[PDB]
Design a protein around this ligand. Structure first.
Ligand code: BCL
Ligand code: BCL
Ligand SMILES: CC[C@H]1c2cc3[nH]c4c(c3C)C(=O)[C@H](C(=O)OC)c4c3nc(cc4[nH]c(cc(n2)[C@@H]1C)c(C(C)=O)c4C)[C@@H](C)[C@@H]3CCC(=O)OC/C=C(\C)CCC[C@H](C)CCC[C@H](C)CCCC(C)C
Ligand SMILES: CC[C@H]1c2cc3[nH]c4c(c3C)C(=O)[C@H](C(=O)OC)c4c3nc(cc4[nH]c(cc(n2)[C@@H]1C)c(C(C)=O)c4C)[C@@H](C)[C@@H]3CCC(=O)OC/C=C(\C)CCC[C@H](C)CCC[C@H](C)CCCC(C)C
Ligand SMILES: COC1=C(OC)C(=O)C(C/C=C(\C)CC/C=C(\C)CC/C=C(\C)CC/C=C(\C)CC/C=C(\C)CC/C=C(\C)CC/C=C(/C)CC/C=C(\C)CC/C=C(\C)CCC=C(C)C)=C(C)C1=O
Ligand SMILES: COC(C)(C)C(=O)C/C=C(\C)CC/C=C(\C)CC/C=C(\C)CCCC/C(C)=C/CCC(C)CC/C=C(/C)CCC=C(C)C
Ligand SMILES: COC(C)(C)C(=O)C/C=C(\C)CC/C=C(\C)CC/C=C(\C)CCCC/C(C)=C/CCC(C)CC/C=C(\C)CCC=C(C)C
Ligand SMILES: COC(C)(C)C(=O)C/C=C(\C)CC/C=C(\C)CC/C=C(\C)CCCC/C(C)=C/CCC(C)CC/C=C(\C)CCC=C(C)C
Ligand SMILES: COC(C)(C)C(=O)C/C=C(\C)CC/C=C(\C)CC/C=C(\C)CCCC/C(C)=C/CCC(C)CC/C=C(\C)CCC=C(C)C
Ligand SMILES: COC(C)(C)C(=O)C/C=C(\C)CC/C=C(\C)CC/C=C(\C)CCCC/C(C)=C/CCC(C)CC/C=C(\C)CCC=C(C)C
Ligand SMILES: COC(C)(C)C(=O)C/C=C(\C)CC/C=C(\C)CC/C=C(\C)CCCC/C(C)=C/CCC(C)CC/C=C(\C)CCC=C(C)C
Ligand SMILES: COC(C)(C)C(=O)C/C=C(\C)CC/C=C(\C)CC/C=C(\C)CCCC/C(C)=C\CCC(C)CC/C=C(\C)CCC=C(C)C
Ligand SMILES: [Fe+3]
Lengths: 255, 51, 325, 44, 51, 273, 44, 51, 51, 44, 51, 44, 51, 44
């Protein structure tokens, strides 16, 4: 085989062509990932002077099922929160924020939730996706330990009530939530706990994220037979906020 | 004595610290047993090229 | 400690799911009969089956079975039809490609005819499976990304088996059908044409393979980390952004200065995985046809390292000193 | 003064005696064992 | 040295005691396993010793 | 410059050590105690590498080579020109990797999520430490580590592989290669399925998890689910790393002869006639 | 005045006195051990 | 000096004592091991030298 | 030329200062290192040779 | 009046004055160093 | 020089003391090990060579 | 006054006094050790 | 030159101080290490050679 | 007036005064050390 000029042959041509293609592909991949969260803002809520070297992409349209309309991105932020109880700890940018009231009750920090749609998620048939186990026909426990009837222990060793039901995902045959009936001392009504934050034992179910006194302020569902995306977000994040805000020692340095 | 003041002045997990102490002595015990598999069977090498 | 979501605490079982349908009538070809495995339910889904039986699938199954039986019976006959010896030497037998002296002509059955027949069957089976994977996506109303990613690997398959032997003008350039023989072929191919380390496209394919493994580790860890916010339901997060996507993006933005979206990370994963066989096939296709020594190519192109020290054991120690005498 | 355990001076002073009596006896036993071992095979 | 009893005003006594016992047991373990030295120190072996 | 949803997450706390002494951001990056340590170690390592390159006599990226000492120096220290710079850079790299992992831990704690990512990074750190620390320590010389060169760290791999005649006959190498290939295939399939579900042909509605489950049950007769696939991928990657470490660590200090000969236990079993 | 732990001044003085009293004894025992070791086998 | 007592108005005594104990034990173990890893300062064999 | 001050109506000084400092230090280090890779201007070797 | 950073004209002038004041000092120090180096070992 | 006390109006002493202690101990350990890694200043080997 | 930590002027002065006293004691001990080491085995 | 104090209307000291603290120690350590790698300015081998 | 950090003019002047006071001492110590090193082993 011969060379076109100097040491340049077919392999070098292929290598340079691949270099060009890879550069274009990297540009495309980076630009495709800027459809959420832009343009950038400063710490006062205003548009920043610097926006980066990659310009914004063009628009694309999603056609959603069940007649819920269309979604076009990039666009305005419809999940934006309105009034946040936060305070700046400095006059410039690059410094943390300070909660104004109760961070667990105000939904800030690790307890933050997003403003999702106030409608339940639907399966292929158009039914609510997550349903209590007492309304699902033909479903039963096949393995593991049944948590129904067991007492619930909080993060500080307090028993707050019993597990009364489970909320399952009928389409995927997976358990999503555990329902809890509270003792009159610790509150009233029923509360939901996501399955990812519980440890089922032979005689008890333990929730280490929050303490006993934090159980009465868990967000409640409006309907007893379904839950919406907004409620799931608020319930699930309230439970996540306790890993930091349930005690003063969880926030200060461990050393 | 009078008592062990274990009525309302002792809400304590008497075992918590010792469990951590015992766990500490666990990983330092298994490391010796792991390095024991290979050190008694020493090996020597002969260099035949640049470093 | 906190629950880590690696094994499921409690399982539930309901009526079996038969599958969605549309006017294409997918039901007419699906089988009837399902099972449940509690052992697998600790990790993933427990329902097993049903499967879709088209014509491409049946053709592929029959033809691949024919290839398997041809290879197995040739290996059995090579040992004298002794079952204990067939079991003893299973990892060492093979169905060898033809001899170099026959070029591209059809060789005798003793020296490569069965190899060609089995290769033809294997090619037919693989193409049938690809057509099936295209047809299924066409009938469920979905994109054809699965077909493209399979075609990415089929490209390297064909380059290793069909295109390069034709370009080099010999059927003896193929790979033998065996466990240890195919590794022997890999090593001999690497040695025969210089050093395959100094082939730039082998390096590029290695780069993309490492990146793909790293990216799945990262993505699996990230998704399991934010699963307490319903992070495993990725499609609903794409259609309606929640807090899980925001936290997952902010983790990587605070870690390395840039992040992705719930839909854009899958594009990254698809491309890193697909780019490996493409670069590998491009690099393999150039060996022998264009470049015959890759170390000499590197030396001529000035990226081969140079060493100053000497060679030999006598430049560093003594034979008696090594023994301890 | 300060007490994060919930005892007074008298309680700590009484609870220290048992600990000191044990420590000072477990050590005498260790000293006798060490002396016996040294008599057996010296290591200095 | 006269006021060393005040450590219990800072540290819980029983949590200290359990951890102390665990630490002492592990310390004794090692020293007896290291003293299983084949010099003038291993005595468990007495069969292949001086019988 | 923040994202439109980032400000409410930028709160204080969640530090293992340092409090508010290092609790701030520099651009997008988060700074802490371990960020400071990482910056120091990485900058020192890079500057030392370029000093060694200057003293070598070449600045070509393809040709820079910093090598470990000779085998005669044992486990002691070598002159900084005859391989001591390699030891210093190794110490700096270990420190930087550990600091990076702990910074990831701090970020995870602040965001209120799980600690899976630092645990996954720990396996790669373990593999690197096995390559540069454990195996040379067992073999008895720091000269068994690979050099720090772009093209000179492949000659080491080649020579180490050919030191056992046929490295493809190593069973742990077989396991690691199989895990690597399986991980790549699983990643490709997962990405393709998600992209196809979210991007239908023009004029068609988007799909959901039920559609994906049906597709793979029609395709191969089984579906792992939207949650089991991530577990499977993570486990595959971790297993690949672990078995790579095992394969490299058994080659030198445990086995000495050629690898093909290891199969004589199977080839000479008494059951065979 | 300045108190990040909530402790007063006199309690801090008493605590420091006890801590110094313990530290001096520990140092004296270590010094005796070092002197005996140097007598047995010098390192200078 | 004279005013060094004010360190206890900055640091919490419990964590200080725990860290001090851990650090002292680790330092003592490291020094004893380093002495054991030498030739001139290994007391198990020096007795056999003078035996 | 008399209107060069209008560059700060386009660029934020906070980012420009950081970028300029990093660039200047990197350039100075690169030049000081390039001088040391020769023989005529390497002051360490010249000092060694003149003694 | 164009402004992307939110500054005013007078603010920009006052900033540029000090910026150039520092730049001239940096350049003068560099020039002196270059002159001394050239006197030591020439390159031209 | 007489107004250096204002550094504590910028930095929290509680978070500075721990970092200072860690830095000082690590520096001391590094310097002692660096001395140990040579031949002229290895006080463990001069003891053996002298006797 | 300016304060990012919450301390006052008098408290900062009081803290700096003790910090400098400790620094001077540490420096004196280090100086004595260095002098002894130089006498034993001189560098430079 | 007399208006250099206006930099503190641009930058907060809390970040600049830590950046400078890291930079100075990095510079000092590299310079000392670079000196230690030569033959004419290595003060450890000089003492051994002189004695 | 331009102020990104929220400080006033007098505060910035005081801060600059203290910063320059520290810088001059650092530079003087470095100069003395360099003079001693040059007297010990010249590099020019
Ligand atoms: C003659 C050559 C021999 C051979 C000899 C060897 C030897 C010898 C080795 C293996 C190793 C491996 N072999 Mg083999 N191997 C051969 C050919 C093959 C073939 C093939 C023919 O197809 C395959 C598929 C493989 C594949 C493999 C993997 C199983 C394994 C790679 C380790 C790994 O990925 O750890 C990945 C882990 C890491 C080391 C990652 C470390 C990452 C660190 C922690 C972070 C980096 C930070 C970075 C500096 C940041 C800076 C960047 C900033 C942005 C600036 N081998 C041939 C047959 N093989 C290697 C192995 O198992 O190693 C343990 C190895 O050493
Ligand atoms: C001594 C060995 C030589 C060497 C010789 C080779 C050769 C020769 C080759 C590789 C190739 C590769 N090398 Mg190399 N390589 C070496 C050292 C290494 C090392 C290392 C030391 O760590 C690494 C990391 C690798 C790894 C790699 C990969 C990057 C690459 C494989 C591409 C791929 O996607 O494979 C994945 C495999 C495939 C996609 C094959 C196609 C699969 C098809 C689709 C199968 C169809 C299904 C089937 C018919 C049905 C089965 C039955 C079912 C159960 C129904 N090499 C040394 C230097 N290397 C390949 C390449 O591309 O290089 C350019 C290649 O050919
Ligand atoms: C890596 C992907 C490859 C693959 C995977 C694969 N196929 C699978 C599975 C998997 C992981 C199953 O779990 C499922 C199965 O039933 O396995 C036993 C199956 C399957 N794929 C099949 C065929 C098949 N797949 C093909 C494709 C592939 N298989 C891919 C290339 C091909 C090819 C290449 O042509 C064929 C011929 C069927 C045999 C089966 C579809 C299941 C079905 O139709 O009915 C099964 C249900 C039952 C009637 C009962 C369960 C079956 C049990 C074996 C009996 C009882 C066991 C008990 C209920 C629990 C099982 C225990 C577990 C440990 C399995
Ligand atoms: C992006 C590149 C990566 C990749 C991708 C990839 N591979 C793919 C795909 C994709 C996207 C598919 O869609 C396709 C698939 O079906 O995946 C589930 C496939 C596939 N890649 C495969 C293998 C494979 N991929 C590999 C690698 C890779 N593929 C790359 C890493 C490798 C190697 C060497 O690393 C191998 C060996 C298959 C599992 C499958 C292709 C199936 C096929 O072509 O089947 C044809 C049919 C036959 C040959 C008939 C076989 C008959 C048997 C004798 C019995 C029936 C099968 C039975 C299930 C096995 C035995 C079971 C026992 C219980 C009896
Ligand atoms: C679904 O979910 C998911 C997401 O979401 C939706 C995701 O997104 C992702 C993420 C995935 C992707 C984005 C895909 C692309 C990823 C890859 C291809 C992986 C490979 C990545 C890389 C090659 C890039 C990685 C780059 C690295 C590690 C380098 C970056 C680091 C630095 C520049 C330094 C870090 C900064 C520190 C430590 C802070 C600074 C230190 C200090 C002490 C501050 C003090 C100040 C100073 C020192 C001076 C000022 C400092 C400056 C300016 C810093 C710069 C300094 C320099 C010297 C240059 C995943 C997986 C996911 O599943
Ligand atoms: C050679 O190199 C190596 C590393 C191998 C070594 O060998 C190095 C070894 C060391 C460095 C070793 C160091 C060892 C120590 C410093 C050990 C110290 C040990 C102690 C201080 C132990 C003290 C034990 C005291 C006891 C047991 C006293 C009394 C106990 C009791 C009376 C039990 C009952 C107690 C009470 C209070 C009543 C119970 C009431 C309740 C309410 C719980
Ligand atoms: C040779 O090179 C290498 C690297 C190998 C080395 O070996 C290097 C080694 C070093 C660099 C070593 C460095 C070592 C140090 C810096 C050591 C420092 C040690 C100390 C400061 C030790 C302090 C110890 C103090 C002690 C033991 C105090 C004890 C106190 C008490 C027991 C009193 C108890 C307190 C009570 C009861 C509180 C009262 C409560 C009230 C409420 C009143
Ligand atoms: C956790 O926080 C708190 C505050 C509670 C603490 O820090 C608590 C700490 C403790 C409770 C610490 C406890 C520590 C001990 C109990 C330590 C005990 C130490 C010893 C008993 C050490 C003994 C060492 C003896 C040695 C080294 C002997 C050597 C002998 C020879 C080498 C023989 C040669 C001797 C000759 C020739 C005699 C010459 C000697 C002369 C003195 C002249
Ligand atoms: C030989 O070949 C090779 C490739 C090897 C080379 O070496 C090639 C090298 C090059 C090509 C090098 C090129 C180098 C350059 C182009 C360098 C340029 C450098 C500059 C323009 C530097 C300018 C620096 C200016 C400074 C530091 C000025 C002022 C700073 C300050 C005054 C700081 C204080 C600021 C204040 C107070 C402003 C605040 C004011 C208010 C009113 C708020
Ligand atoms: C040779 O080359 C290599 C690279 C190998 C090197 O070795 C290079 C080495 C270096 C470059 C080393 C550099 C080292 C330094 C820069 C070291 C600096 C050290 C210090 C600045 C140390 C400072 C120490 C200060 C101390 C100890 C102060 C105070 C201590 C106290 C105990 C005081 C306690 C204070 C109280 C109680 C205040 C309370 C007051 C109230 C009002 C509550
Ligand atoms: C030779 O080639 C190679 C590459 C090898 C090199 O070695 C290259 C080397 C270089 C290129 C080196 C370059 C070096 C520099 C540019 C160095 C620059 C150094 C400085 C500008 C240092 C500045 C130091 C300033 C100091 C120490 C100031 C103050 C310190 C204080 C402790 C004062 C603290 C202030 C307070 C408390 C103010 C509080 C006031 C209130 C009102 C609250
Ligand atoms: C007899 O006993 C029974 C019945 C039990 C059996 O049947 C036993 C069977 C066995 C024990 C079987 C064992 C089989 C193996 C160990 C098989 C191993 C197979 C391989 C490793 C195969 C590799 C194949 C291919 C490779 C590596 C690369 C590329 C190949 C191709 C592209 C092939 C395609 C060929 C083409 C396009 C050429 C066709 C020719 C034409 C003229 C069209
Ligand atoms: Fe995913």
């Amino acid at each position: 085989e011969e060379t076109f000029f100097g040491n340049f042959d077919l392999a070098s041509l292929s290598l340079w062509l691949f270099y060009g293609f890879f550069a274009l592909l990297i540009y495309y991949l980076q630009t495709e990932n800027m459809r959420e969260g832009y343009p950038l803002e400063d710490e006062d809520g205003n548009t920043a002077a610097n926006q980066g070297p990659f310009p914004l992409p063009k628009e694309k349209t999603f056609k959603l099922q069940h007649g819920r309309g269309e979604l076009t991105l990039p666009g305005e932020d419809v999940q934006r929160r309105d009034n946040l109880a936060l305070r700046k700890t400095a006059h410039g940018n690059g410094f943390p924020m300070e909660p104004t009231g109760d961070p667990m009750l105000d939904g800030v920090g690790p307890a933050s939730w997003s403003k999702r749609r106030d409608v339940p998620e639907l399966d292929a048939h158009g039914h609510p996706k997550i349903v209590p186990m007492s309304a699902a026909e033909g479903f039963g426990v096949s393995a593991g330990t049944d948590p129904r009837g067991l007492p619930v222990m909080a993060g500080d060793g307090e028993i707050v009530g019993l597990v009364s039901d489970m909320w399952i995902d009928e389409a995927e045959q997976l358990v999503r939530y555990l329902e809890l009936e509270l003792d009159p001392e610790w509150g009233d009504g029923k509360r939901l706990v996501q399955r990812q934050m519980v440890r089922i034992k032979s005689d008890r179910v333990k929730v280490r994220s929050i303490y006993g006194k934090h159980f009465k302020n868990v967000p409640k569902t409006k309907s007893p037979n379904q839950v919406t995306l907004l409620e799931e977000d608020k319930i699930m994040a309230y439970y996540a906020g306790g890993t930091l805000y349930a005690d003063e020692s969880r926030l200060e340095p461990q050393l | 004595k009078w008592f062990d003041e274990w009525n309302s002045k002792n809400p304590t997990d008497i075992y918590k610290p010792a469990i951590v102490v015992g766990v500490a002595g666990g990983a330092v015990f298994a490391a010796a047993l792991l390095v024991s598999m290979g050190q008694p069977l020493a090996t020597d090498s002969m260099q035949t090229g640049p470093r | 400690p906190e629950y880590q979501n690696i094994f499921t605490q409690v399982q539930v079982q309901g009526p079996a799911e038969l599958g969605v349908d549309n006017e294409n009538n997918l039901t007419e070809e699906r089988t009837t009969g399902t099972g449940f495995s509690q052992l697998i339910g600790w990790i993933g889904n427990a329902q097993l089956g049903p499967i879709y039986l088209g014509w491409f699938g049946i053709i592929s199954l029959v033809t691949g079975t024919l290839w398997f039986n041809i290879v197995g019976f040739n290996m059995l006959s090579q040992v004298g039809y002794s079952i204990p010896e067939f079991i003893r030497q299973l990892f060492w037998l093979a169905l060898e490609p033809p001899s170099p002296e026959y070029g591209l002509r059809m060789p005798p059955l003793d020296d490569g005819g069965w190899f060609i027949i089995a290769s033809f069957f294997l090619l037919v089976s693989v193409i049938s499976w690809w057509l099936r994977t295209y047809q299924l996506a066409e009938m469920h109303k979905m994109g054809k990304h699965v077909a493209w990613a399979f075609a990415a690997a089929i490209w390297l398959f064909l380059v290793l088996g069909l295109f390069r032997p034709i370009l080099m003008g010999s059927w003896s350039e193929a790979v033998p059908y065996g466990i240890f023989p195919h590794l022997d072929w890999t090593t001999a191919f690497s040695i025969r044409y210089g050093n395959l380390y100094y082939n730039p496209f082998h390096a590029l394919s290695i780069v993309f393979l490492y990146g793909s493994v790293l990216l799945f580790a990262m993505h699996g860890a990230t998704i399991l980390a934010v699963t307490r916010f319903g992070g495993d339901r990725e499609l609903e997060q794409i259609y309606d952004r929640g807090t899980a996507s925001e936290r997952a993006g902010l983790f990587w933005r605070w870690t390395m200065g840039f992040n992705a979206t719930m839909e854009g990370i899958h594009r990254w994963a698809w491309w890193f995985a697909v780019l490996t066989p493409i670069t590998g096939g491009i690099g393999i296709l150039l060996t022998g046809t264009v470049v015959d020594n890759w170390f000499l190519w590197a030396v001529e192109h000035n990226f081969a390292p140079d060493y100053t020290q000497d060679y030999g054991y006598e430049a560093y120690t003594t034979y008696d000193g090594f023994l301890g005498r | 003064d300060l007490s994060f355990t919930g005892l007074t001076d008298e309680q700590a002073q009484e609870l220290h005696s048992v600990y000191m009596s044990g420590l000072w006896l477990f050590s005498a036993v260790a000293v006798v064992a060490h002396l016996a071992t040294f008599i057996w095979r010296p290591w200095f | 040295m006269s006021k060393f009893y005040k450590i219990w005003l800072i540290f819980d006594p029983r949590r200290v005691f359990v951890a102390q016992g665990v630490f002492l047991f592990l310390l004794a373990a090692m020293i007896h396993l290291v003293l299983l030295s084949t010099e003038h120190f291993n005595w468990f072996e007495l069969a292949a010793a001086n019988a | 410059a923040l994202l439109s949803f980032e400000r409410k997450y930028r709160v204080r706390g969640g530090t293992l050590i340092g409090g508010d002494l290092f609790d701030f951001w520099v651009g997008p990056f988060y700074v802490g105690f371990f960020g400071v340590t990482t910056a120091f170690f990485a900058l020192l390592g890079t500057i030392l590498i370029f000093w060694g390159a200057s003293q070598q006599g070449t600045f070509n990226p393809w040709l820079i080579n910093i090598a470990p000492p000779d085998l005669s120096y044992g486990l002691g220290m070598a002159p900084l020109m005859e391989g001591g710079l390699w030891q210093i850079i190794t110490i700096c790299a270990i420190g930087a990797f550990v600091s990076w992992a702990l910074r990831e831990v701090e970020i995870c704690r602040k965001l209120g999520m799980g600690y899976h990512v630092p645990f996954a990074f720990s396996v790669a750190i373990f593999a690197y430490v096995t390559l540069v620390v454990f195996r040379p320590l067992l073999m008895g010389a720091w000269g068994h580590g690979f050099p720090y060169g772009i093209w000179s760290h492949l000659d080491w791999v080649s020579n180490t592989g050919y030191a056992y005649l046929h490295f493809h006959y190593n069973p742990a190498h077989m396991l690691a290669v199989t895990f690597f290939f399986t991980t790549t295939l699983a990643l490709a399939l997962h990405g393709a399925l998600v992209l196809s579900a979210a991007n239908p042909p023009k004029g068609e509605e988007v799909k959901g998890p039920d559609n994906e489950d049906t597709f793979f049950r029609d395709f191969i007769g089984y579906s792992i689910g939207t949650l089991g696939i991530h577990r499977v991928g993570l486990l595959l990657a971790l297993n690949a790393g672990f078995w790579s470490a095992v394969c490299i660590i058994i080659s030198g200090p445990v086995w000495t002869k050629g690898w093909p000969e290891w199969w004589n236990w199977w080839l000479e079993m008494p059951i065979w006639p």
